[PDB]
Write a protein that binds this ligand. Structure first.
Ligand code: FE2
Length: 54
């Protein structure tokens, strides 16, 4: 799975770690994260994230 970054603050969503405190378990692909989730560091919506191509 690929990492995704918040294009507003730079936070990186890493699918191997998820965002468990906000209900996203490790191993969740960004696309499957419920669409009302927001960046844990600045609060903007998932629509401000972009795939990090490796
Ligand atoms: Fe952010």
């Amino acid at each position: 799975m690929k990492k995704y970054t918040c294009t507003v603050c730079g936070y990186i969503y890493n699918p191997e770690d998820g965002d468990p405190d906000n209900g996203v378990n490790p191993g969740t692909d960004f696309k499957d994260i419920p669409d009302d989730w927001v960046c844990p560091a600045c609060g903007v919506g998932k629509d401000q994230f972009e795939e990090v191509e490796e």
